[PDB]
Design a protein around this ligand. Structure first.
Ligand code: ADP
Ligand code: ADP
Ligand code: XER
Ligand code: XER
Ligand code: K
Ligand code: K
Ligand code: MG
Ligand code: MG
Lengths: 319, 319
């Protein structure tokens, strides 16, 4: 479509998490902003699918995701200008439907690429496509969820921004989730100890942490159980340190799971790479790093082969 | 001198720590090897001084070190071929004298460069000169000390190679040294806990660890005391983890000393850089990294601003 070609050239206007902390006229300004911003971001994704190597773009699962993005651009651009609160309520129902229609895009992309990637000349190309597609999708989802959340009245929240986020509380929520998955598979899970700036509270968007934290915790718990198959009733603790400063929030997850082997170290950050249904599909580590870098931070690993691994998640503060 | 020009072109023949684990005829073969190898390594250092920027090479302290290296090449090349045990005993006395004559070369280089570096166009140049000079000097010293040590009969030692090196024991020797320096300055020192592969024993050359370990321990202890000036009677422990695998030995030193600030992070590995007589002269960190890389390993830092720093020393095993 020619409409897609016009918007794929338009530059995306990035919204700062600080800018987001800005009658009902504010919901209209937000919906109108979204209606200008979303089609441009969708069009840049469509350009990405059009630029995929022919043999990969031809995959029926990859074609399905490409078609979904075209459909999202069509539905968003065909929506009439939002003049009043009634149009704004209709818009919310469309954004909510598109949020659900695209809930499994990461799963579908992994399936489509799984076999087709093995037929290409550039290994770096698929990593670039996934880093760009998944981080842009995360940005689209945060914008969409923020607008819908501006209608709710949660205490300590302005849309998706938590004004008093406690890292200890959000880590504990995901430790409980990971211990349950771990206990279901092994009958036992490593005890998690949290130290450092346990009392820290500050404005923050939980959404990225809601993806990254269960991933890293599942990895630390699985490694601990797999390295202690001979004593599953006596496994070492996972230790989490919170460090909070004016520049960034640092979360260190240290495990005693044997470390990442020297042979595997240069492949752990590749998509699809896994040494394994509790783990995933080899997307946890590369996706979490792309998300952290997209949000002005980083994801770094330090392997102590024979002992364990320290993972450092760094996320920039809201200004 | 023209003799220096001829040997500065000759390639150095690197001796593997494994090759070193090879009547009195073996001392002669070693002294004869040294007599061919040392002048070439000394000549490459002289070439380095000749290539220093004119304003830096002119410094009287830098000129003194340049002259010392010329003198070492002259004395080693003028020494007559070693035919017997008597010539070999005379050679040992010269190597021992040169080891003492050059004991302070790192101190003299730091002094000479301290002011003169501030008059140059290439910042990277001084780092390259120091990394190359200090690591080559370390290689010269290990060769010289190994030959002299082949005359001694220490149990568990073939020259300078320890056949059953315990990382826990060598770390404890340097923890005692650092706690004494720390207790003398503050009246108290952080307690050091050692965990991981505490029972590990393997062939290893202690000499590089004898430089790196007191440096990193002095840094961890100083940072802990400087960050707890309000409670000097209650400071947090320094935690050392030993990880031993077939490829390398990893030693992690974790402190609760507040971390390395974001402003200072990109300068801590520069020579002369210090935030400070117990510390040194800003050479500890860059020298330790150059030494670790020279020996097929690495020195990496992870800063948790507001909490502490984790330092990872990795050293390749003897094959
Ligand atoms: N804490 C850890 N300890 C040991 N191995 C780990 C750890 N974290 C990650 N790994 C390794 O990295 C591989 C890839 O990780 P990831 O991308 O998250 O996908 P998956 O969870 O599906 O295996 C894992 O299969 C595992 O071998
Ligand atoms: N463990 C640590 N914690 C905090 N700061 C550290 C640590 N290790 C090194 N540093 C910082 O790095 C700087 C440079 O270190 P170094 O090169 O070893 O020289 P020096 O010991 O003379 O200060 C120190 O002055 C200090 O600010
Ligand atoms: O890929 C996604 O996850 C999503 S969620 C969403 C909501 C919209 F309004 S468009 C859109 C897209 Cl394209
Ligand atoms: O710079 C040094 O530390 C040394 S020690 C030593 C022993 C020798 F035989 S030459 C020589 C040099 Cl050049
Ligand atoms: K992976
Ligand atoms: K320094
Ligand atoms: Mg995972
Ligand atoms: Mg030091």
């Amino acid at each position: 479509q020619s409409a897609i070609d016009a918007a794929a050239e338009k530059p995306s206007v990035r919204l700062t998490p600080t800018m987001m902390l800005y009658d009902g006229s504010h919901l209209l300004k937000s919906a109108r902003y979204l209606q200008q911003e979303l089609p441009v971001r969708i069009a840049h994704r469509i350009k990405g699918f059009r630029c995929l190597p022919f043999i990969i773009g031809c995959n029926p699962t990859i074609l399905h995701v490409h078609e979904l993005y075209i459909r999202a651009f069509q539905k968003l651009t065909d929506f009439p200008p939002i003049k009043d609160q009634a149009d704004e309520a209709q818009y919310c129902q469309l954004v909510r439907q598109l949020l659900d229609d695209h809930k499994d895009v990461v799963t579908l992309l992994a399936e489509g690429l799984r076999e087709s990637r093995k037929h290409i000349e550039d290994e770096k190309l698929v990593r670039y496509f996934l880093d760009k597609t998944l981080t842009s999708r995360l940005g689209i989802r945060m914008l969409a969820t923020h607008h819908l959340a501006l209608h709710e009245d949660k205490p300590d929240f302005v849309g998706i921004i938590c004004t008093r986020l406690s890292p200890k509380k959000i880590i504990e929520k995901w430790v409980d989730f990971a211990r349950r998955l771990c206990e279901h598979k092994y009958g036992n899970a490593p005890r998690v100890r949290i130290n450092g700036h346990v009392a820290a509270r500050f404005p923050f968007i939980p959404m990225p942490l809601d993806y990254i934290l269960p991933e890293l915790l599942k990895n630390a718990m699985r490694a601990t159980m797999e390295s202690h198959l001979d004593t599953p009733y006596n496994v070492p603790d996972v230790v989490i340190t919170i460090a909070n400063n004016d520049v960034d929030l640092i979360i260190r997850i240290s495990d005693r799971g044997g470390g990442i082997a020297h042979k595997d170290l240069d492949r752990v950050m590749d998509y699809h790479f896994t040494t394994a249904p509790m783990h995933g599909f080899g997307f946890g580590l590369p996706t979490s790093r792309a998300y952290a870098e997209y949000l002005g931070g980083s994801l770094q690993l330090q392997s102590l082969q024979g002992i364990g691994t320290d993972v450092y998640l760094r996320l920039r503060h809201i200004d």
